[PDB]
Chains A and B, each alone.
Chain A
Amino acid sequence: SHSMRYFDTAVSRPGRGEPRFISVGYVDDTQFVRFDSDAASPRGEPRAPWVEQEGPEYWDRETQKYKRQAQADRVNLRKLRGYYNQSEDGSHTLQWMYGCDLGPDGRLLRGYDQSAYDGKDYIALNEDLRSWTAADTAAQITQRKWEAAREAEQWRAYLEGTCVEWLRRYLENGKETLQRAEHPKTHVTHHPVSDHEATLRCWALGFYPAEITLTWQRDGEDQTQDTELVETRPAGDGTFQKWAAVVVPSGEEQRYTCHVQHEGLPEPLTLRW
């Protein structure tokens, strides 16, 4: 499913100024916007060409919203230090993620609104968009407040409404990239690895979206246990890269095949050395 997600990070830095707030937004695996409270004149800024075309009222309003959330998070960090009786000397992190996944009917499939403090879950909106999960006593304080304020009903309306509406708009305006997979460019390399063994490495480069599967089989059998697989990584131009490698006895290379599955391939590819 297509998805829109915002990732917000607020970090206190006592003795080094006020907390820094950074936010990025994505459609699927494409970033489209950033905001950084430490920038010279902090603004929501485009990072994809399909939102650069949104007009000046759009960017003014997004800027406004970011600035108000940054302010509120400086307060949030203070509050959290108090809830946990933390020292004023320590640095702390509050992270928030919210957004929506788009269903086949063009409506909300799943919405998200959740948070972590110092790397661990704090409070999250439940999948029913009606109720909250608080991880500890401090978070239960926020929960009770938010229950009494009907915060979940407000979030529900945003997630079902605006969030999906904007996602759909972005997907249409960006369709040539967001709705069109770029297939992986694939090849195999061979690296003699001792006097009698060799590494075969199956490469997938230049692909979008990031989801991919690379597997080595020997005699048609998955070598799951003996395959080194790196984590899929960004190329830096909006595409991704991955490889999988296996160490084989020299001369047995022909029994090995690399299998590539990706949404941009109509049938899985097989490569061989």
Chain B
Amino acid sequence: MIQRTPKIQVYSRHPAENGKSNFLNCYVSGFHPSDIEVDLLKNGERIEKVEHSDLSFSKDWSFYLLYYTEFTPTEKDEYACRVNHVTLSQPKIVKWDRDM
């Protein structure tokens, strides 16, 4: 089979404002095959209420998914996206950086 490793972006739906409700996004793209594990993390802990878009793919046949959850950012809380896939020996964790 052709396997392709996922690209990952972590970001909010709206520009972040401390204490305003928002959505935290983890966009996974460019990957094949389609089985992938994606968790959203708050201070290292798995967030339970996470939804995802319906599986779709690009012209080159690689897959993409958006994982998302409502959240209210604060100065202190640290958020991240944890991704595993068959192409990875270990999970990739990408931190939410509000400037990216």
A-side interface residues toward B, CB under 8 Å?
A: 7, 9, 11, 22, 24, 26, 31, 34, 36, 47, 91-93, 95, 97, 116, 118-121, 189, 191, 201, 205, 230-231, 233-237, 241, 243
Bound Cα distance A11, B1 (Å): 13
Residue from B3, B34, B63 having most chain A Cβ neighbours under 10 A: B34
Secondary structure class of chain A's binding surface, majority of residues: strand
Contact residues in B for A31 (Cβ distance below 8 Å): 53-54, 56
Bound Cα distance A212, B53 (Å): 22
Taking CB as reference atom, which chain A residue is nearest B86? A91
Could you write out 26 A-B pairs with CB less than 8 Å apart? Answer: A11-B35, A31-B53, A36-B54, A91-B33, A92-B1, A95-B61, A118-B1, A119-B1, A119-B3, A119-B4, A119-B32, A119-B61, A120-B61, A189-B99, A205-B15, A233-B11, A233-B25, A234-B25, A234-B53, A234-B66, A235-B14, A236-B23, A236-B25, A236-B68, A237-B13, A243-B100
> When A36-B54, A95-B61 are in contact, do A118 and B2 touch as well, CB less than 8 Å?
yes
Count A-B contacts at CB 8 Å. Answer: 74
Contact residues in A for B23 (Cβ distance below 8 Å): 236
> When A22-B55, A236-B25 are in contact, do A9 and B7 touch as well, CB less than 8 Å?
no
> What does the 1/0 interface line of B2-35 toward A look like (CB < 8 Å)?
1110010101011100000001010101001111
